[PDB]
């Protein structure tokens, strides 16, 4: 029942994300600039941690979080896209490093001037290395149809992403929806678009094996710990616990009872075989 209310996890690479979200380490908001190529064996998340700065949400975000928690950190490799005929310097007032900017890991695509046009550009990336990729893109659902026409020219917009297994299409509906993808090695993604598209710039590659927690306390470097729960660290050799059932790691299993006492000692007769508390009258204190 006694828990250390500090995350003491020395001997392991530990990063404290803080204001940075878990999904943010791929997207790259202003609050995750120092965790873009992080490598750790314990990825701690926070209550105030936000995945994005621009208003929007992911798709299969719980699955992506469960992939990222055991990822062991992500290794960014540039996909090599460069764009001719369109502007790749889109910014917003919501995300501010120094001035009005956008994500560091992905590039917002616009037109040359307002209401002009948008060329049908198609791009591709081939996985050279043997680890699976973690490609993610974005679709910009604009606030108004007039703003959509100003940003990406007049007409309907069609964005499709294809691969060996993944094959889908997206249409904006007039604010940013991020869709990820699991890309097997020696497979070519295809980013065909003619409009709103938060185009990727770097590909995330998984480093190894780790485990992620979701806490609200500080980080220490003193214990040799295996399992951490949402309000501290539980270390013991005991088999059962009572603190929290959502603990992640290698820790005692959760039971409802608060005190299960194993009789390490023997039967006390103070002042089944029938010797103790039997023909023997009472126990002895002088031994």
């Amino acid at each position: 029942r006694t828990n250390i209310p500090r995350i003491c996890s020395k001997g392991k690479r530990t990063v404290d994300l803080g204001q940075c979200g878990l999904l943010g380490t791929i997207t790259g908001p202003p609050q995750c600039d120092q965790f873009l190529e992080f490598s750790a064996d314990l990825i701690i998340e926070r209550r105030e941690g936000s995945d994005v700065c621009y208003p929007g949400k992911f798709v299969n975000e719980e699955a992506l979080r469960q992939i990222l928690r055991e990822s062991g950190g992500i290794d960014k490799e540039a996909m090599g896209f460069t764009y001719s005929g369109i502007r790749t310097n889109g910014a917003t007032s919501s995300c501010r490093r120094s001035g009005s900017s956008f994500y560091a890991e992905m590039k917002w695509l616009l037109s040359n001037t307002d209401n002009a046009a948008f060329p049908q550009m198609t791009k591709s990336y081939k996985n050279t290395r043997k680890n699976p990729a973690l490609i993610v893109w974005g679709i910009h659902h604009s606030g108004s149809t007039a703003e959509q026409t100003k940003l990406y020219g007049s007409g309907n917009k069609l964005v499709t992403v294809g691969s060996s297994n993944y094959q889908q299409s997206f249409v904006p509906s007039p604010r940013i929806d991020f869709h990820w993808l699991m890309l097997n090695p020696n497979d070519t993604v295809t980013f065909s678009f003619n409009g709103a598209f938060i185009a990727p710039d770097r590909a995330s590659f998984l480093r190894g094996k780790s485990m992620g927690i979701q806490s609200g306390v500080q980080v220490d470097a003193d214990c040799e710990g295996d399992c951490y729960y949402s309000g501290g660290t539980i270390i013991s050799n005991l088999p059962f616990q009572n603190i929290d059932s959502r603990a992640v790691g290698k820790c005692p299993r959760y039971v409802k009872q608060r005190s299960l006492l194993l009789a390490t000692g023997m039967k006390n007769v103070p002042e089944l075989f029938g010797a103790i508390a039997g023909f023997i009258e009472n126990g002895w204190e002088g031994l």
Partner: antibody
Amino acid sequence: QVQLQESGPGLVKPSETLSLTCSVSGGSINSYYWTWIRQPPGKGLEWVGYIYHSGSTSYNPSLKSRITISVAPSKNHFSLELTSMTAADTAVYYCARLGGHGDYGSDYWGQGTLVTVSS
Amino acid sequence: DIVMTQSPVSLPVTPGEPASISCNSSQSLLHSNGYAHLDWYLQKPGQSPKLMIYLGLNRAFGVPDRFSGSGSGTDFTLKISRVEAEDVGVYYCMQALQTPFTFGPGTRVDIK
């Protein structure tokens, strides 16, 4: 834009090792394939081999075991190094990244250096 | 190795004509999606080639609307609907499907 520019010698003795350079500007070699297009005078373009930023390469089978393309430790410099230079191998060497490996509607070529095999 | 062939060798043009250059292939140049992996290059004399048509039928930036590539499978053809004086030069078609990479023999487009 990723602007490319190549430089190197122009007077090269026969059966001597050739060495060029191609320094990019506007970007750096951290992604994509980098191609070393060959052109003899009056003949067609010949691809001799691309190089990835990691180090993997795919050389030309017709010119195997003659060209050692390597990228410098600095990430804004990659070079060609050809062994056993032939008088029939006199060409106008180019330096480019080609828009067929990836981003399809964008490519950037060099300027075109002159090499000559004479005594 | 994939060999490239194209017809004709030299097609002379008058300023103002509908013109057609066709480049053939010895193997079907279709990747897993990604359209058809052949691109069109255009070389001025004493300069470097720059991309005109990528993936067979898509126009690159800086390319006027007169150029229009088309084709599928192994038959690829470049069409020009209006010939001016700045279209003179050698035409190269490149496959970008599998290693090794080869160019065409070249289409020396002269005048008259």
